[PDB]
């Protein structure tokens, strides 16, 4: 007794309503956005890359890295559903399973441990936990992971900033602001290292 | 086979809704704004040019450099469609192609390779790659190219500032901030060389 067609449409329209929530919480969008935010503030440029471009890059990146799970949903939950092979209730479960598996690969056991105790449910295996518990654990792990990557990328720009300030202080021109002179070198290092292609490749490879 | 009048209208309104995205992700708007962002940051003025006029000049600059491609879209796609020479499906493809060609002229081979492997698809010719994968490669190349131009624009202003600081220190006045003295010199040398006209030539002509 699968859900009637009227209820099936009502469920799907509700999922489209929560589409921003699914992208910003259940996907890779948050980690990429935060790492780009740290990198932008690491250099002297405040909002030169602009917010729309940063989100635009992240949206394409989060679509590419989640193409495997997106295809797995299609090949196991959409095509059997359209070919009249699985109950609509079964197809919904078949779509949710790869999404849960992907979120578990990028989560930390400490995050699961605190939220499982917070929910107060007696579950032992770290695979049959509810989405209500998994999603906050996943987004918490993504924020912490983004900070680690953000600190990693920040260090070389801190090195340049300290060197420029030290060299200027060596000549006794303490009045000269190190930030104005440091910025072209920060652009210099990031461009001869091929930073933009490098960071997006690492962010793509990070989700594994 | 061809889309009905009702459906074609729906597609037209949809592209108008995404019009800001097409400007800042497919056209030359991103490179111009980033380069102009460096120019404002290089000089001692922080918000003095203000954000409004920079975007407005960038929009007019884009319409100038996109005029060949926009006219090519007009001739190849709009004119047969208005005269009812071709169907809506092929007219849409005839409009998409000039945009794809322009994005290929402003991208790099390495950037395309990274994203085509990232998408996990099969292709052998760059000319028939999907626009969904070309867009992230296009802007990534645009950001790297803009940083290169901005770095070159930042050097002469750094040159002027370092000279003024050295002169003041050499004269013995270790108490005066170089920024106040250097700012008129940076502005004077920006005007008597007609700096913006030179930047227009190296920015508008950089696409070709």
């Amino acid at each position: 007794e699968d859900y009637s067609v009227t209820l099936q449409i009502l469920a799907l329209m509700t999922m489209l309503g929560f589409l921003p929530a699914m992208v910003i919480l259940m996907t890779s969008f948050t980690r990429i956005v935060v790492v780009m935010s740290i990198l932008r503030q690491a250099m002297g440029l405040q909002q030169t890359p602009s917010n729309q471009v940063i989100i635009g890059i992240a949206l394409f990146l989060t679509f590419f890295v989640m193409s495997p799970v997106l295809n797995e949903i299609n090949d196991k939950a959409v095509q059997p559903y359209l070919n009249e092979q699985v109950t609509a209730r079964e197809a919904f479960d078949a779509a949710q399973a790869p999404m849960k598996a992907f979120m578990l690969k990028q989560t930390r056991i400490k995050d699961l441990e605190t939220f499982v105790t917070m929910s107060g449910e007696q579950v032992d295996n770290p695979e049959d936990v509810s989405m209500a518990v998994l999603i906050p654990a996943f987004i918490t792990s993504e924020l912490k992971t983004a900070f680690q990557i953000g600190f990693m990328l920040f260090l070389p720009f801190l090195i340049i900033d300290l060197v420029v300030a030290s060299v200027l202080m060596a000549m006794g021109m303490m009045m000269l602001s190190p930030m104005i002179v440091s910025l072209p070198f920060k652009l210099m290092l990031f461009v001869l290292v091929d930073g933009w292609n490098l960071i997006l490749s690492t962010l793509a490879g990070s989700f594994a | 086979e061809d889309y009905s009048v009702t459906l074609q209208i729906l597609a037209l309104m949809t592209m108008l809704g995404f019009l800001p995205a097409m400007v800042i992700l497919m056209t030359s708007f991103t490179r111009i704004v980033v380069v102009m962002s460096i120019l404002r940051q290089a000089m001692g003025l922080q918000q003095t040019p203000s954000n409004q006029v920079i975007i407005g000049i960038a929009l007019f600059l884009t319409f100038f450099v996109m005029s060949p491609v926009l006219n090519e879209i007009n001739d190849k796609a709009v004119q047969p469609y208005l005269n009812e020479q071709v169907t809506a499906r092929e007219a849409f493809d005839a409009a998409q192609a000039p945009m794809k060609a322009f994005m290929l002229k402003q991208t790099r081979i390495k950037d395309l390779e990274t994203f085509v492997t990232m998408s996990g698809e099969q292709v052998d010719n760059p000319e028939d790659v999907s626009m969904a994968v070309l867009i992230p490669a296009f802007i990534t190349s645009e950001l790297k190219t803009a940083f290169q131009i901005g770095f070159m624009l930042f050097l002469p202003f750094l040159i002027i500032d370092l000279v003024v600081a050295s002169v003041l220190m050499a004269m013995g006045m270790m108490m005066l901030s170089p920024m106040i003295v250097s700012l008129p010199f940076k502005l004077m040398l920006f005007v008597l060389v007609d700096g913006w006209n030179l930047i227009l030539s190296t920015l508008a002509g950089s696409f070709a």
Binding site: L70, N71, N74 | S4, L7
Partner: peptide, 21 residues
């Protein structure tokens, strides 16, 4: 695949509109 999902949906709507007209 998933990309063709949108294409198939639009074609069905176009076919339904074409038959209705």
């Amino acid at each position: 695949d998933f990309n063709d999902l949108l294409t198939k949906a639009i074609n069905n709507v176009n076919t339904l509109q074409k038959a209705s007209g």
